[PDB]
Paper text:
The central component of this network is the heterotrimeric cadherin-catenin complex consisting of E-cadherin, β-catenin, and αE-catenin. Mechanical regulation is focused on αE-catenin, whose C-terminal actin-binding domain (ABD) and central M domain undergo structural transitions associated with binding-partner engagement that can be modulated by force. Recently, afadin’s short C-terminal coiled-coil region (residues 1393–1602, hereafter referred to as “afadin-CC”), which is required in canoe for morphogenesis, has been reported to enhance F-actin binding by the cadherin-catenin complex through an unknown mechanism, providing an alternative explanation for afadin’s stabilizing effect.
Analysis of these segments produced a final density map at 3.1 Å resolution. The first is a coiled-coil density bridging two adjacent αE-catenin ABDs, which we identified as residues 1508–1578 of the afadin-CC using an AlphaFold2 predicted structure of this segment. The second density extended from the previously resolved proximal portion of αE-catenin’s CTE (residues 844–871, which we here refer to as “CTE-N”), indicating folding of the disordered distal portion of the CTE (“CTE-C”, residues 872–906). In the structure, each αE-catenin ABD interacts with two neighboring actin subunits along the same strand, while each actin subunit contacts two adjacent ABDs. At each interface, the C-terminal arm of the coiled-coil makes extensive contacts with the ABD towards the minus (“pointed”) end of the filament (ABD1), while the N-terminal arm makes more limited contacts with the ABD towards the plus (“barbed”) end (ABD2). H1 from ABD1 is repositioned to bind beneath the central joint of the afadin coiled-coil, where residues 694–698 become reordered, forming interactions that mutually stabilize afadin and αE-catenin. While CTE-C was unresolved in both the pre-bound and post-bound states of the isolated αE-catenin ABD, afadin strikingly stabilizes refolding of the entire αE-catenin CTE on the F-actin surface, pinioning it beneath the C-terminal arm of the coiled-coil.
Residue numbers in the entry:
A (entry chain H): 690 to 903
B (entry chain G): 1508 to 1578
C (entry chain A), D (entry chain B): 5 to 375
E (entry chain D): 189 to 375
The structure:
């Protein structure tokens, strides 16, 4: 089975160099950039100071415009339905978040020059751009899944010809089976106040990791 | 790309400023070239006159602008 | 191609593939729409949230339930949930999988006719079949005889089965389930000054019920001890950092299952209604029907409900009888688990309602074949 | 081509081109007229000075503010300021530049209707739009969920926003801002023997406040340290060379924001105005509103105002939760920056008020569209 | 009413001025039979304008706000609330009773309290209730003129009854039983 595993790697690595012509590869490039600026708060990533974050803000925002172009082409060829309406809803949010990153990063750049770094010595000014970055990524994950559904549902439909639909280059993993019972632990005895369960927010790495090449 | 972005405008402003800062050097070189020619022609006096006037005004503007960076 | 086992109850939707031992999609069966004014541009195009995303935005949404008392009332919203559980939660093609649907006993005849019509016409499923909540629970228990007490979110019903044979005349149905208990707890909490009025706040009370409520072995003794001391008190923290306390309301909310007069209903309690059904059966089969008592559904998850249930039946049945109660730890998903067993059965592959049969007979084919 | 973005407030006027990162014209919103006899021939023809040039000649003018408490009261002087910023400040022709205006919430309807009428009829712009100042502060903060505390020169208001949805019933507007603090400072300064009664002298007192006033973390303790020693004294030099000294008045003037009873107002301080606004929202979104608390406006520029607000909120909110305060260094221009983001947006290019729609609807078109 | 009065330029902020607004409400507000029609008529003409004089001598004018304030009773979403209006709440309560008494409950609809004295609330409630109930049933609404003091009038009737003296809470009963006696006896 050692020889078999090499074929899967070759097919998987074959799409990492598609020059951003596919939607899925662009989203994967997006997520890696965001994790770098997310890890900046803990100070254990490639970024070192505020100026690094500002440079990363332009790169993720510029990649947002190409994502809008890719998504809108599928929507135009898709006939009017529930899937198409959901697809265009997120494309409205991408334009807002991308535009916010461009203007806000410029403002943080000018303030650095005028008052020096001591004005932005605290990391508080950094989370203004980081908050908009993870806001953008949530919409990017949603529009990828919406675009995939419309592609598979209307793969045979007229107008989808000569297009790079995810339905012909990617496959979904079957969702993991739910636990039949939540195992009890001994820590609840120590706590005298029973609280509500924290909502589980999906991680963009895990949301995109379920994609597999044909 | 989706919307107008300030970075492109900033680049345009910087390029315009550099063009304006090089056109004065070109003007000074032209004045130096027409001044040092011993021969003189009728169609050269007006050009050279306008050239010193423009250069002198530009130098006055530069001198006035420089002082504004001090207190 | 494996079949789909979808168990769409009043409260939660359970879906998965036949042959497995656990569902893959378990989300609330709600549809929410915004009720405020959108100011930020581009953030208001979405106008309907389904399932988990709706529950994560309760602050700016109003939550509606497409199913109440086990009967579908809104059909536009129900189609939205079915579309959400095929393409998003399961990510499969509905047009190449036979689908197994479930329905509660004694529901309106037109309810399952509309369920079949939507499946064939809209989702283009190759085949389908409709089952019964209580029947599928026996498979999960691995038994062929017994009486099933399924208490979900919209309905409570009993079905006695002996050696794989049903007794329709002895089937009892009661419209008192978990949703009614939430409303009673919401009203009872007003005695201490806590008020919840919004649909989002009703989901907060549901969380309190599932974490602090329990069934008292003896009701009168607990009432005497509740007033004398303060050893039965507990605290719960609201999402906004506030803390509330609960006294005797912990064992009063589940106790109305045995005394429906608390909510104003004249129907007998769950302990009495299952005893009446047993005595409606033949005298020969009552010997084992007292044992093999199967409980299923989320409402049967209160602490001590089995202990109270056994005590009440013993005081009614003759002392010679042996009374046993089966309460598996996984009984919240018993209905779905029995659905997978039936769908993957070797001898079950010959009564799927094929699309060709539907064309020549219309939606009315389900009544004569599906049970 | 480029769309103008003009943010006209009670004290200052901000204008520029959409899509930029900073305004191109910032001048005071005052109009002055001579009050002295003119004896030199030809020097008295000018009868009105607007903006910066009026500020340089305070000695022979009577300064007036066309806008007070966020409401335009002199429509003749307001047109003078709008003409100044379109021709003498931006050097643009209004006929080919749609403009974006701002206005505070809970403001009379006649304010924006007459604002729109002037733009279309007098200056003849192709399109326009009127937005809310507190909403635009969230655009500049790179956020879509939070509560905005905007305090300018005439009005202070709170607007909570969750996921791009506003809650109009939770908006609180308080008419107490920097201009009221300037008037209180003049009265307070008379205790040391200084008198400023002229309108030109009010500009001197305003500059004293911006350079010497601060918010004390604990007012009662600070007052004790003010009387015992003289370490809090600072000196300011008047234009004519006279030197004044300020003692405990440095922190007494900004204290009226948290204790409005100093001026005689019955209202509550700005610290518990925000808490009341939060508590009027739904219980589920209060967690995200305690954090993401955005401050804007020039009145919120006092040293220590952010730390003081956090201490006061934490004493009111439940101790389990966390309270954050967002105070960007450039918060004096947050309203304008948000306006530049909105006007240049691609998805916003369809909701301008074109001149064609104004023809068939009149000034009332703004209520149904601009909101 | 204080919030929507700022649209015309009048501002009341203090607690002393909250009593001024209450007096304005009791004299100028009424319930619109058809909300949409009144909105159109208010914009078409100024025939619904009325004036009020403040204590200091100022005079204010109020237009369509006269019928907008009582409308929030039937449309609670105006003040941001989620529950249904009073016309629908009193119908949901009827359906929660057994079917045998719903005919007698549809008749004998009694109102009380000062909030029910708006001019036209009796007519508006009848119009909305009949649209929900089946057309066969009949709807009657009782609106006594003295309904502002209906609660006290019934109280004096009960306390003076000749068969009521045996259910008072005597002081000696409270002395040995404590304040908890009020729960089981008083109702
Ligand atoms: N631990 C618990 N204790 C008490 N009640 C519960 C508990 N967990 C769930 N419930 C209630 O049981 C119901 C579960 O619904 P479910 O068992 O899926 O049947 P259905 O699918 O018909 O709603 C929920 O409405 C919930 O209120
Ligand atoms: N650094 C500062 N410290 C204290 N107060 C200030 C400071 N800067 C400005 N102010 C006051 O706040 C006001 C700021 O006005 P601004 O917010 O720019 O527009 P608007 O006129 O709409 O309020 C000014 O009137 C001034 O009195
Ligand atoms: Mg169920
Ligand atoms: Mg302002």
């Amino acid at each position: 089975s050692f020889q078999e595993e090499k074929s899967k790697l070759d097919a998987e690595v074959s799409k990492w160099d598609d020059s951003g012509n596919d939607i899925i590869v662009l989203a994967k490039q997006m997520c890696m950039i965001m994790m770098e600026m997310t890890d900046f708060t803990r100070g254990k990533g490639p970024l070192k100071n505020t100026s690094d974050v500002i440079s990363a803000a332009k790169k993720i925002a510029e990649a947002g415009s190409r994502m809008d172009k890719l998504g809108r082409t599928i929507a135009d060829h898709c006939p009017d339905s529930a899937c198409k309406q959901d697809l265009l809803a997120y494309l409205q949010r991408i334009a807002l978040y991308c535009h916010q990153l461009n203007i806000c990063s410029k403002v943080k750049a000018e303030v650095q020059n005028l008052g020096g770094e001591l004005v932005v010595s605290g990391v508080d000014s950094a989370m203004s751009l980081i908050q908009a970055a993870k806001n953008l990524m949530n919409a990017v994950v949603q529009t990828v899944k919406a675009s995939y559904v419309a592609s598979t549902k209307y793969q045979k439909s007229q107008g989808m010809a000569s297009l790079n639909l995810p339905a012909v280059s990617w496959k979904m993993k079957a969702p993991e089976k739910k636990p039949l019972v939540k195992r009890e632990k001994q820590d609840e005895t120590q706590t005298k106040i029973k609280r509500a369960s924290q909502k589980k927010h999906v991680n963009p790495v895990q949301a995109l990791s379920e994609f597999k090449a044909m | 790309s989706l919307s107008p972005d300030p970075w492109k405008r900033d680049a345009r402003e910087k390029l315009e400023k550099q063009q304006q800062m090089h056109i004065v050097d070109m003007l000074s070189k032209e004045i130096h070239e027409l001044q040092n020619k011993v021969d003189r022609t009728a169609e050269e006096s007006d050009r050279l006159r306008k050239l010193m006037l423009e250069w002198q005004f530009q130098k006055r503007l530069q001198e006035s602008k420089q002082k504004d960076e001090d207190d | 191609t494996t079949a789909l086992v979808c168990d769409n109850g009043s409260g939660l939707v359970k879906a998965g593939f036949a042959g497995d031992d656990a569902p893959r999609a378990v989300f609330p069966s709600i549809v929410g729409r915004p009720r405020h004014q959108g100011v930020m541009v581009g953030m208001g195009q979405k106008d309907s949230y389904v399932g988990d995303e709706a529950q994560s935005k309760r602050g700016i949404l109003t939550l509606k339930y497409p199913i109440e008392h086990g009967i579908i009332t809104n059909w536009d919203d129900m189609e939205k949930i079915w579309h959400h559980t095929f393409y998003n939660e399961l990510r499969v093609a509905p047009e190449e999988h036979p689908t197994l649907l479930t329905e509660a006993p004694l529901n309106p005849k037109a309810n399952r006719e509309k369920m079949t019509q939507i499946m064939f016409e809209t989702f283009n499923v190759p085949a389908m079949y409709v089952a019964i909540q209580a029947v599928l629970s026996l498979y999960a228990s691995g038994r062929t005889t017994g009486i099933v007490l399924d208490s979900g979110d919209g309905v409570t019903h009993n079905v006695p089965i002996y050696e794989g044979y049903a007794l329709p005349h002895a089937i009892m149905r009661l419209d008192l389930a978990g949703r009614d208990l939430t409303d009673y707890l919401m009203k009872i909490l007003t005695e201490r000054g806590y008020s919840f009025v919004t649909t989002a706040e009703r989901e907060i009370v549901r969380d309190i019920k599932e974490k602090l409520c329990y069934v008292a072995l003896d009701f009168e003794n607990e009432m005497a001890t509740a007033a004398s001391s303060s050893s039965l008190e507990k605290s719960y923290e609201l999402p906004d950092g506030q803390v509330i306390t609960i006294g005797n309301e912990r064992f009063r909310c589940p106790e109305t299952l045995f005394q429906p007069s608390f909510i104003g209903m004249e129907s007998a309690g769950i302990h009495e209604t299952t005893y009446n059904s047993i005595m409606k059966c033949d005298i020969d089969i009552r010997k084992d029907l007292y044992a093999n008592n199967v409980m299923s559904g989320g409402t049967t998850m209160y602490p001590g409900i089995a202990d109270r249930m056994q005590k009440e039946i013993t005081a009614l049945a003759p002392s010679t009888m042996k009374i046993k109660i089966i309460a598996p730890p996984e009984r919240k998903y018993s209905v779905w688990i029995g659905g997978s067993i039936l769908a993957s059965l070797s001898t079950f592959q010959q009564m799927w309602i094929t699309k060709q049969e539907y064309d020549e007979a219309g939606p009315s084919i389900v009544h004569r074949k599906c049970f």
